[PDB]
């Protein structure tokens, strides 16, 4: 049973239930075998009718094409960043300040 990697729109797999998708929310996605975490937003870019999901310099699925609705989406990661704690001193006080 020979197989080939995801270089084309997928045809044959199991009968997994396809639920409705949501937009502008922190939701996991599973688009034709690839999974990731992020939000789904409408994009103003262009995808030639033959074009599959795009890629970037860092080789990540920045944009995907819906096989059902034939719609335009982007993948962007969640709101993350470093946290800074301001400690005036252990002997001075226990109050701290949280900086994002």
């Amino acid at each position: 049973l020979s197989f080939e990697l995801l270089h084309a729109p997928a045809t044959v797999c199991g009968p997994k239930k396809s639920t409705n998708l949501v937009k502008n929310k922190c939701v996991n996605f599973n688009f034709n075998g690839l999974k990731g975490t992020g939000v789904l937003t409408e994009s103003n870019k262009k995808f030639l009718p033959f074009q599959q999901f795009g890629r970037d310099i860092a080789d990540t699925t920045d944009a995907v094409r819906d096989p059902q609705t034939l719609e335009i989406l982007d993948i962007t990661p969640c709101s993350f960043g470093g946290v800074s704690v301001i400690t005036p001193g252990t002997n001075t006080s226990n109050q701290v300040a949280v900086l994002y």
Partner: peptide, 29 residues
């Protein structure tokens, strides 16, 4: 800034892709 400095800052020159992949640039103090 002085007009000489106004010429100086104008002679010295995506960040979102680097910001997404764990690379952050702290602003100068």
């Amino acid at each position: 800034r002085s007009p000489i400095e106004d010429l100086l800052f104008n002679k010295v020159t995506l960040i979102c892709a680097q910001k997404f992949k764990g690379l952050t640039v702290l602003p100068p103090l």
